[PDB]
Amino acid sequence: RAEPTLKHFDENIISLIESEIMSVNNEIGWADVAGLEGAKKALREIVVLPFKRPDVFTGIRAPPKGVLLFGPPGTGKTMIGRCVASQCKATFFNISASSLTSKWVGEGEKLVRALFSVARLKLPSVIFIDEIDSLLSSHESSRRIKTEFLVQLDGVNTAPDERLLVLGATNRPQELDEAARRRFQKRLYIALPEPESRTQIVQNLLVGTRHDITNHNLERIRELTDGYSGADMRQLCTEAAMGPIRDIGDDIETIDKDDIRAVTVMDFAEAARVVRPTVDDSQLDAYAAWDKKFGCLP
């Protein structure tokens, strides 16, 4: 890297950040996400507008240095992070906590440290940390990678107007002590998609696939998919899409792709019998309870 301020980091490490972790994608808009409108408006207020207008969002309007996305898995918390970053024309730094403590154990400390320095250099910056519950919970390499990470977090709070936010995500927020939670002054519950969002997803996933799903069919798909996460929804569509494939048996080997039957609601009805929602009501009750004590969404 030509950056004079990163000449003291391993070239391999900077090279890593550059090609796997750092991205700039400013054309995602809000991506018409299945993400709830309440969350959407919150991180608009908590992140996007404080990044756009640092002059307005000061005093009590000032953004927190850390935001926690928590809830059931398969809600696409990562893509939300990516949108949020795009929304404020921030440099996106996408990293997984497993990657730090597994894939990249060797020089994990240097990577964490270099990540915050590159972030600091490319302001405004969003650092998205997947499955942050790992990092923040309490073999030996983990200790330093975590320590170094805690050091870096407390280090962002050494400059008021740096448009640098750490966005952590977890499917297991209960695994976070009074001290890990403190690092994240705002904590948004990302809920399972609402009925409207379930169908928007179906529609999204069906493009490029021949289907005869009507506007009325969607009502049905809604009642079929109560309790589904987005991921469950995707699994559903894939299953449904198999319908036209199975009907033709051995003809799949020779059939013209356009002569394959259209996906119908019947396919979804049948597919709903096969797919199973990933999270049970216990997990939901738990999230909801945690959200009551430490959450900030209404």
Residue 76 assigned ligand-binding role: yes
Residue 225 marked as a ligand binder: no
230 annotated as belonging to a binding site for a ligand? no
Q: What is the resolution of this structure in A?
A: 2.6
Architecture of domain 1-192+276-298: 3-Layer(aba) Sandwich (3.40)
Distances, alpha carbon 189 to alpha carbons 40, 92, 201, 226, 249, in Å? 11, 21, 20, 18, 44
DSSP H helices, 158-298, are 195-206, 215-224, 230-246, 265-274, 281-294
Q: Which of 29, 168, 4, 10 is nearest to 97 (CA)?
A: 168
The answer to whether 77 is annotated as binding is yes
Quickly count: other Cβ atoms within 10 Å of residue 122's Cβ: 16
Annotated binding residue 75: yes
Looking at domain 193-275, its CATH class is mainly alpha
Question: How far is it, in rounded angstroms, from Cα 296 to Cα 231?
Answer: 25
Beta-carbon count within 10 A of 217 CB: 18
Q: For the chain, what are the domain ranges?
A: 1-192+276-298, 193-275
238 is in an annotated binding site: no
Q: How far does CA 90 lie from the centroid of its chain? A: 16
Residue 208 annotated as binding?
Answer: no
